[PDB]
Design a protein around this ligand. Structure first.
Ligand SMILES: [Mg+2]
Ligand SMILES: [Mg+2]
Ligand SMILES: [Mg+2]
Ligand SMILES: [Mg+2]
Ligand SMILES: [Mg+2]
Ligand SMILES: [Mg+2]
Ligand SMILES: [Mg+2]
Ligand SMILES: [Mg+2]
Ligand SMILES: [Mg+2]
Ligand SMILES: [Mg+2]
Ligand SMILES: [Mg+2]
Ligand SMILES: [Mg+2]
Ligand SMILES: [Mg+2]
Ligand SMILES: [Mg+2]
Ligand SMILES: [Mg+2]
Ligand SMILES: [Mg+2]
Ligand SMILES: [Mg+2]
Ligand SMILES: [Mg+2]
Ligand SMILES: [Mg+2]
Ligand SMILES: [Mg+2]
Ligand SMILES: [Mg+2]
Ligand SMILES: [Mg+2]
Ligand SMILES: [Mg+2]
Ligand SMILES: [Mg+2]
Ligand SMILES: [Mg+2]
Ligand SMILES: [Mg+2]
Ligand SMILES: [Mg+2]
Ligand SMILES: [Mg+2]
Ligand SMILES: [Mg+2]
Ligand SMILES: [Mg+2]
Ligand SMILES: [Mg+2]
Ligand SMILES: [Mg+2]
Ligand SMILES: [Mg+2]
Ligand SMILES: [Mg+2]
Ligand SMILES: [Mg+2]
Lengths: 116, 70, 87, 101
RNA sequence: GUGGGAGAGGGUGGUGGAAUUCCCGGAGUAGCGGUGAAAUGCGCAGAUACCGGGAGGAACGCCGAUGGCGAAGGCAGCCACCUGGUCCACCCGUGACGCUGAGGCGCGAAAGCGUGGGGAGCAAACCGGAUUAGAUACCCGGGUAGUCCACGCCCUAAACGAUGCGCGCUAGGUCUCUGGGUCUCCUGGGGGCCGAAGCUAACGCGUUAAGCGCGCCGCCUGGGGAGUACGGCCGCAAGGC
């Protein structure tokens, strides 16, 4: 009940999960998914397979809204940070472009002990 | 691969206003380029940096960019 | 700070004869000028420590050139001293 | 009196009564702080690398000056207090160090 | 003295972007987070992810080096002002004015103390979840002092080159920062690496001496007891000498 044509697809990957949100060309989301959205629970959520299925599920869910051309944004690193873009490619969405936007500070904030 | 200064005129390292040139020492992203790729001497690079950062605060050069393909 | 105008005006003030740059007199003049600048700079800025050390040093020098001068000619020393407002 | 270079980047969108206004106000500042004006370069409309004040562009000014030192700071404060002036950068002049000589 | 130079040397004021947290708004479902696995925790009062807007604190990515400055502690966004040290060239000026330095005085990371601000992230103590034979720990989720600033104390340290300062003398080679030159190269001045002679118990040091000498200061004299006790002095205290 939108019929959105072309759109943006963000992939946020971590060591604990991947999630994909899909969104409109001015930035508002449409559907999303994640390893926990589809079956998985524990650590199991940040496997690359789960990354795949999240990618897919979100992309079929985008077919339902009538998505065709998609521009990709990627943020973070985890297993199947890549596998999500692999699935997202052969998903039946024509991929406009991939981009890596991962946010990094110009060194402002103390990290947690696990991070130094 | 070419080092920047190898292909270039005889140009102010001290001009923060000239973007055409200063752009050439930025990377694909906003990152200032290593000496390896700017073919610059020690002092030279040191001046270049400061002129870039100036220009950046002037909105002429990008503080950071986004990476394409990936 | 101290520019060439000021600097010179002082050296031509304290020279033993025309042309003299490094007389004991002139060194203590120039010294004493710099000293005064700096102790004014630390009238504010009491948190500038490194400059302060510099001044302890400058002072040390002045005091040595005086100690000498007085050993050599006492008279020209008394001169230098009243002229500068010191000790 | 030392030699500086004042960069001014102000809102692009101005029309004429407006643009001439802010420019004369900059002027009244430089007169008031004792700034002799050796040259001016008005570059104007330019594409910024990053948005400044929500705006993708900027209007560009460059002024070589000789002014007394202890003022340059205050002069910059007053130059900034204007709303339409989005950046002020004053810089002590330098000689042109070259490269690939 | 003159004339050049390099620099995160100090102090003061301004200012820029990235990021975190938070709040307002949009769009959007059912999870997010987290770990070896988990659970506490957060989420239907709408979270995470995404977009736009605001606020606030702290720290400065690339440049960045095996680099630089500083007496040491230590010092990194940009700008301006105030200021210290130092290097080279010129060979101009004084004419031994030098070196060291018990005491004194000043500086002195971090933590800590006092009075008043500030508070994003982090985080002793503490509160929970786990793990384990037990867990008072590591691992996870919270969180206060603190970290930040102003002023005044504290005076410790693997405050390390574990190498006191100054000067003269004794092969080179190689990389480098920064000056000057008639600029394959020379010649000052810093940073490294190999290595002559020599030194050293060895390891190693070797024109940045741990070599050959001279000056002056500090210090040592088996281990434990013990940086304890008593005494003094300093300190608000902690505690220091
Ligand atoms: Mg997980
Ligand atoms: Mg303004
Ligand atoms: Mg500095
Ligand atoms: Mg400073
Ligand atoms: Mg909301
Ligand atoms: Mg609930
Ligand atoms: Mg609940
Ligand atoms: Mg707040
Ligand atoms: Mg680095
Ligand atoms: Mg200086
Ligand atoms: Mg002579
Ligand atoms: Mg003579
Ligand atoms: Mg002593
Ligand atoms: Mg201290
Ligand atoms: Mg402290
Ligand atoms: Mg306190
Ligand atoms: Mg925390
Ligand atoms: Mg337990
Ligand atoms: Mg904790
Ligand atoms: Mg000795
Ligand atoms: Mg040369
Ligand atoms: Mg040094
Ligand atoms: Mg050398
Ligand atoms: Mg060497
Ligand atoms: Mg031998
Ligand atoms: Mg050796
Ligand atoms: Mg020696
Ligand atoms: Mg020995
Ligand atoms: Mg002892
Ligand atoms: Mg004994
Ligand atoms: Mg003790
Ligand atoms: Mg006794
Ligand atoms: Mg006692
Ligand atoms: Mg007492
Ligand atoms: Mg103790």
């Amino acid at each position: 009940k939108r019929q959105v044509a072309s759109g943006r697809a963000y992939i946020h990957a971590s060591y604990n999960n991947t999630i994909v949100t899909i969104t409109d060309p001015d930035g508002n989301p449409i559907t999303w998914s994640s390893g926990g959205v589809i079956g998985y629970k524990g650590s199991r959520k940040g496997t690359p397979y789960a990354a795949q299925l999240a990618a897919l599920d979100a992309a079929k869910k985008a077919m339902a809204y009538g998505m065709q051309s998609v521009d990709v944004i990627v943020r973070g690193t985890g297993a199947g940070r890549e596998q999500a873009i692999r699935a997202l490619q052969a998903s039946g969405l024509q991929v406009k472009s991939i981009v890596d936007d991962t946010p990094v500070p110009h060194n402002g904030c103390r990290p947690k002990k696990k991070f130094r | 691969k070419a080092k920047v200064k190898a292909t270039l005129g005889e140009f102010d390292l001290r001009d923060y206003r000239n973007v055409e040139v200063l752009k050439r020492f930025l990377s694909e992203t906003g990152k200032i380029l290593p000496r390896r790729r700017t073919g610059l001497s020690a002092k030279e690079q040191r001046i270049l940096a400061k002129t870039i950062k100036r220009a950046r605060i002037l909105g002429l050069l990008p503080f950071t960019e986004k990476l394409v393909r990936k | 700070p101290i520019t060439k105008e000021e600097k010179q005006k002082v050296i031509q003030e304290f020279a033993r004869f025309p042309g003299d740059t490094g007389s004991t007199e002139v060194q203590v003049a120039l010294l004493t000028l710099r000293i005064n600048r700096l102790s004014e700079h630390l009238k504010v800025h009491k948190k500038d420590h490194h400059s302060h050390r510099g001044l302890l040093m400058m002072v040390g020098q002045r005091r040595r050139l005086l100690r000498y001068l007085q050993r050599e000619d006492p008279e020209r020393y008394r001169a230098l001293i009243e002229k500068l407002g010191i000790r | 009196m030392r030699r500086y270079e004042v960069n001014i980047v102000l809102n692009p969108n101005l029309d004429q009564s407006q643009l001439a206004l802010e420019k004369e106000i900059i002027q009244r500042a430089l007169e008031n702080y004792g700034a002799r004006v050796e040259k001016v370069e008005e570059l104007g409309l330019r594409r910024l690398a990053y948005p400044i004040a929500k705006d993708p562009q900027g209007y560009f000014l460059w002024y070589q000056v000789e002014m007394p030192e202890d003022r340059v700071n205050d002069l910059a404060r007053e130059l900034r207090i204007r709303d339409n002036v989005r950046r002020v950068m004053v810089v002590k002049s330098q000689e042109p160090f070259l490269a690939n000589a």
